[PDB]
Design a protein around this ligand. Structure first.
Ligand SMILES: [Zn+2]
Lengths: 191, 286, 278, 48
């Protein structure tokens, strides 16, 4: 029963309203959260899952909890419209994992990007080097739309996991409609 | 709403005890706790309160975390102790209000329909009262300021408790008319002369400083409207207040005289009582 | 293995919470758990107190909820530092401070749980800042009765303990228990903020506007002087009286200080008239 | 209403069973018929 707590970051935006992935991108994002929460529950019952929108407002939608019932309710009525603000959300997610009293549980972040982020690449790279010092694994699955090639995120992931680091997989949105199961397989195959 | 914000003494101490509890880390530079109080009437009275763990970050004041579980579990257990007790707002230290306060306020607004922020200062100074009351609302300014969403100051008061200063006031206290007009006048001159001047001085500095850093010298109607209300008296030259002559000046003499004439009669009673006390009672050679 | 005149230090927050919780539950004798610190046998300080949710059973050990204690402790761990509870604090309204067989049964369980197991008995009889009806009691073992109950290495502390002495109702049930001295825990900034919030706040200290004054004063000054005119007749009687045998003459009518303070403070309004304003 | 422990006035509430007072109040009924026994020659004349 490996102990891990994951502060996932969901996305709610006009981009998320687009339904190219599955019937709706938001529904597909909810499905992706459902599998990861189930996977954490299979790995350990005590595992804590918490999520928050990284768009416009980046607070805590749900405090990390072993029970997944709160996670499902937060996914319901997510309401999408805010422009993505990944930099504020990523900083909040890393510190929030430290905030949890049970720091013994392994700390991981899974995020969904629905829109291009208007941030200096150096600024996110500086956050990524700080994230590397924090040594908390972050894997991001881009959903529906993303900055072309997620170039800033690819550099951010490399800065986050450089020098033979975890190299947590970064999933650029598959072009056009993507099956949720196709999205789920890459994180299950490797972090 | 929030016509007045009485804060119970027990809550006022509770903020200070929390600051000592987190005194080990001075990085936070403020103490944040859920403020629980009863909306019995328009008057808001704060009662027993608990402090939610919170971190404020200098990085754009966007890295702010409030634990949903701590706020929900503690409030429910505290509500079980008092049915009257309900979330009524939140309390923070850090006398200068941080920009992050409005974002924290939005979460506070969600928890309580008409919540309030009390900026209690754990380190007390002089003048006024420790708690500062602010309520954040969204509206369209009549003149036309964009957004017009800001905290609004509200009147604040101290709550009533029994057997509370036996721990503290018993050592000192001065409950008598002996010090009235002996030191009480000194305190008012000490603060109205200096503290009242300091706020006016801030506006006089603002004539250029508000242009330099302030919202505007010509801004916030009450800057001129309230100042003009304060200038109910003209402020300069003829005045027509103490220079009334036939009016206030003549009255001042009548009352001062009526008050003074008692003192000549007063001296008579005190002097003769001393003469009997020493001239006869002391003089008992026997 | 030897008891002493140990001192229990009550933090202001613990005392304020106990009386407020007690006042709310005075009809139903509410009980609570005292989050004290066992720093050493000689000195025990209760840094914090928390109120148990009202329990139907009473002040009994069964009434205390184990689940509530664990969850409350976890909240204390996350925010600030938690401390092991010294003992149970509770209110007996009928008898200011007293001990009961029901009380001993809970006290014994707390004694088994730890050592000092201090028990506090706050009550509705109260004064604005001078009652301290609350008292602290610790049971004495029957086996320990053969041994001296409280050997004293310090005479002065026993003398301070002697000043409270015993209560007549407490004396009735005193056997099998020993009173333990309670003192306020050191209060510094905490004392200072209430001190700042006393004359300035609890008492009237507007200060900016702290300073009737000329409207009803003329009536009060005439009335007190009229009372003096009648009262001064008694001093006139004493001087005329031979008073060979000492007799009370209703002197010290005074009111001279009351007239002096009222006339002078109102006359000090001249400072407001020409100095505080223009 | 008096506080159980404080013994101070809490609210003003007026409720009295007043059984004897009810007999002295509106207990008596009024007969609707103008002429239950007729005989109204002065009853609806001089008395009215
Ligand atoms: Zn008891």
């Amino acid at each position: 029963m490996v102990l891990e707590s994951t502060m996932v970051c969901v996305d709610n935006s006009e981009y998320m309203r687009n339904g190219d992935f599955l019937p709706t991108r938001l529904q597909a994002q909810q499905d992706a959260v459902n599998i990861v929460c189930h996977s954490k529950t299979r790995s350990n019952p005590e595992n804590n899952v918490g999520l928050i929108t990284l768009a416009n407002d980046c607070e805590v939608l749900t405090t990390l909890t072993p029970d997944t019932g709160r996670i499902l309710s937060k996914l319901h009525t997510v309401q999408p419209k805010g422009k993505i603000t990944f930099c504020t959300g990523i900083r909040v997610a890393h510190l929030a994992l430290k905030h949890r009293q049970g720091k013994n549980h392994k700390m991981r972040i899974i995020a969904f990007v629905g829109s291009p982020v208007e941030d200096n690449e150096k600024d996110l790279v500086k956050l990524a080097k700080r994230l590397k010092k924090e040594k908390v694994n972050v894997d991001i699955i881009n959903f529906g739309e993303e900055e072309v090639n997620t170039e800033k995120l690819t550099a951010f992931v490399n800065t986050l996991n450089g020098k033979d680091g975890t190299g947590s997989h970064l999933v650029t949105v598959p072009p056009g409609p993507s099956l949720a199961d196709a999205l789920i397989s890459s994180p299950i195959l490797a972090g | 709403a929030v016509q007045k914000v009485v804060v119970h003494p027990l809550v006022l101490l509770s903020v200070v005890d929390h600051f000592n509890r987190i005194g080990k880390v001075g990085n936070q530079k403020r103490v944040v706790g859920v403020l629980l109080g009863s909306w019995q009437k328009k008057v808001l009275d704060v009662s027993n309160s608990f402090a939610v763990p919170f971190d404020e970050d200098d990085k754009d004041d966007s890295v702010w975390f409030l634990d949903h579980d701590y706020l929900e579990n503690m409030y429910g257990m505290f509500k079980k102790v008092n049915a009257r007790e309900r979330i009524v707002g939140w309390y923070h230290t850090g006398p200068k209000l941080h920009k992050n306060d409005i974002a924290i306020n939005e979460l506070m607004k969600r928890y309580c329909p008409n919540s309030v922020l009390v900026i209690i200062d754990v380190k007390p100074k002089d003048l006024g009262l420790p708690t500062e009351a602010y309520i954040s609302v969204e509206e369209v300014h009549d003149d036309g300021t964009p957004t017009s969403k800001t905290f609004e100051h509200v009147t604040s008061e101290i709550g009533a408790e029994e057997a509370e200063e036996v721990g503290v006031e018993h050592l000192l206290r001065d409950i008598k008319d002996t010090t009235v007009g002996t030191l009480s006048q000194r305190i008012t001159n000490q603060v109205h002369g200096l503290k009242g001047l300091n706020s006016k001085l801030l506006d006089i500095r603002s004539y250029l400083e508000k242009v330099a850093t302030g919202k505007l010298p010509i801004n916030h109607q009450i800057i001129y409207q309230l100042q003009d209300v304060f200038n109910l008296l003209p402020d300069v030259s003829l005045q027509e207040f103490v220079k009334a002559f036939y009016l206030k000046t003549n009255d001042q003499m009548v009352v001062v005289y009526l008050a003074s004439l008692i003192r000549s009669v007063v001296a008579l009673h005190n002097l003769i009582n001393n003469k009997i006390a020493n001239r006869d009672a002391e003089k008992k050679e026997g | 293995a030897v008891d002493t005149a140990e001192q229990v230090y009550i933090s202001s927050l613990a005392l304020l919470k106990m009386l407020k919780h007690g006042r709310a539950g005075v009809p139903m004798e509410v009980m609570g758990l005292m989050l004290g610190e066992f720093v050493d046998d000689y000195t025990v300080r209760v840094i914090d107190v928390f109120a148990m949710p009202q329990s139907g059973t009473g002040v009994s050990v069964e009434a205390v909820d184990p689940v509530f204690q664990a969850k409350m402790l976890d909240m204390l761990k996350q925010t600030g530092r938690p401390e092991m509870v010294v003992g149970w604090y509770h209110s007996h309204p009928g008898f200011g401070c007293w001990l009961s067989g029901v009380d001993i049964n809970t006290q014994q369980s707390f004694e088994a749980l730890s050592e000092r197991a201090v028990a506090v008995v706050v009550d509705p009889i109260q004064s604005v800042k001078g009652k301290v009806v609350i008292d602290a009691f610790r049971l004495i073992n029957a086996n320990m009765m053969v041994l001296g109950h409280e050997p004293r290495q310090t005479t002065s502390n026993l003398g301070h303990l002697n000043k409270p002495s015993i209560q007549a109702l407490i004396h009735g049930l005193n056997r099998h228990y020993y009173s333990i001295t309670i003192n306020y825990r050191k209060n510094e900034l905490e004392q200072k903020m209430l001190l700042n919030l006393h004359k300035k706040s609890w008492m009237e200290g507007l200060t900016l506007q702290d300073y009737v004054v000329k409207e009803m004063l003329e009536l009060a000054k005439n009335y007190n002087k009229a009372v003096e005119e009648e009262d001064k007749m008694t001093p006139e009687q004493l001087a005329i009286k031979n008073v060979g045998k000492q007799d009370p003459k209703r002197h010290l009518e005074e009111h001279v200080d009351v007239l002096m303070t009222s006339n002078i403070v109102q006359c000090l309004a001249a400072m407001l008239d020409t100095v505080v304003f223009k | 209403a008096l506080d159980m422990t404080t013994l101070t006035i809490m609210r003003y509430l007026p409720r009295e069973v007043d059984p004897l007072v009810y007999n002295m109040s509106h207990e008596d009924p009024g007969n609707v018929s103008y002429s239950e026994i007729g005989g109204l020659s002065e009853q609806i004349r001089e008395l009215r």
